[PDB]
Structure 1
C-alpha cells in the first residue's frame, strides 16, 4: 500500500478539480436563468405593444377592435405567467447552491491548513526517534557494542 502521507496531497488535488467543475457548472445555471428572464420581458413587450395598440383602439368608440386586441394579448399573458412563476422558483435554487459552495470553499482551506501541521509533527517524531535509538546504542546497560565493548577490550 502507498504511504497515506502521499495520499494527503493527491486527495486534496482531486477535490480541487471538482471545485472548479462545480464552479463552471453553477455559471451554466446562472446563464440560463438570465436568458429565461429576457424571454419574459420580450413577450410582455409584445403584449404591451398589443396593449399600446389597445391604447389606440377603443378611442373614438371603436371598442370592437380593442376586444380582439386584448384577446391576442391573453395568449402572451398565459405564457408570461408560466415563465414568471418558473423564474421565481429558480431563484431560491441558485441562492441555495451558491450558499452551499460558499460554505464549501471555507471547509477546503481549513482542511489544507491542518495538512502541513500534522505533517510537521510526523517529521518531528521520525526526526525524534531515529536519533535516540542511536543514543540508545550508547546505553548504560552494556547492551551497547560500540562503547562498552571497546573498553572491555
Structure 2
C-alpha cells in the first residue's frame, strides 16, 4: 500500500480519463441511430414511387399492370415496419444513457472541489507535528529537548 493522499491524485486522473472515453463512445451510438433513420426514409420513398406510378398504371385501363406494383411495394413496406420498431427501442435506450453520463459529470466535480481542501488540512497538521517535536522545551531537563541537551553540555 502507498500513502492515502498519493492515491487520491492518481485515482481521479484515471477517473477523468475514463469519462471522456464514455463521452466519445456515446456519440458513435447517436450516429447509427441517426444513420438508420435516414436510411429508413429512403425505402418508403421508393415505395411511394411505385405507388405514384401505380396511380396512373391503370389510368389507361391497364388494371393488370397496377397489380404487380401494389404487390411489389409490400416487400418494401415490410422493411420499413421492421426498422420503425427497431428505432423505437433504441430511441428510449440512449436517452437513459445520457442521463447517467450527465449525472456522473455533475458528481465528478463535487469530489475534486473537496480534494484540494483535504490536502491543505493534511499538510497543515503534518507540519504542525514536525514543528512541535522540535519545540525544544526547556522544562524537559532530559536531553529530549535539544536546548536542554546543550545546557548539559
Same fold per superposition (TM over 0.5): yes
1:42 positional shift: 0.6
Cα distance in 1 for partners of 2:69, 2:11 equals: 64
Cα deviations by residue, 1:89-146 (Å, 9 ceiling, x for unpaired): 1011110111110011111111111111111110111122222222264446767544
1:5 positional shift: 1.1
Q: How much is the aligned-residue C-alpha RMSD, in angstroms? A: 2.1
Q: Which moved more, 1:139-148 or 1:70-79?
A: 139-148
Q: Which moved more, 1:60-69 or 1:16-25?
A: 60-69
8 Å CA contact retained: 2:138, 2:147: yes
Cα distance in 2 for partners of 1:150, 1:84 equals: 91
1:150 positional shift: 5.6
The gaps in structure 1 that reach 5 residues or longer are: none
Cα deviations by residue, 1:69-98 (Å, 9 ceiling, x for unpaired): 111110000010000111111011110111
Alpha-carbon distance change, 139 to 33 in structure 1, aligned in 2, over 3 angstroms: farther
Q: Which moved more, 1:71-80 or 1:120-129?
A: 120-129
Cα distance in 1 for partners of 2:152, 2:143 equals: 13
1:48 positional shift: 0.7
The gaps in structure 2 that reach 5 residues or longer are: none
Q: Which moved more, 1:106-115 or 1:125-134?
A: 125-134
TM-score by length of 1: 0.88
1:47 positional shift: 0.3
Cα distance in 2 for partners of 1:4, 1:149 equals: 37
Cα distance in 1 for partners of 2:7, 2:56 equals: 74
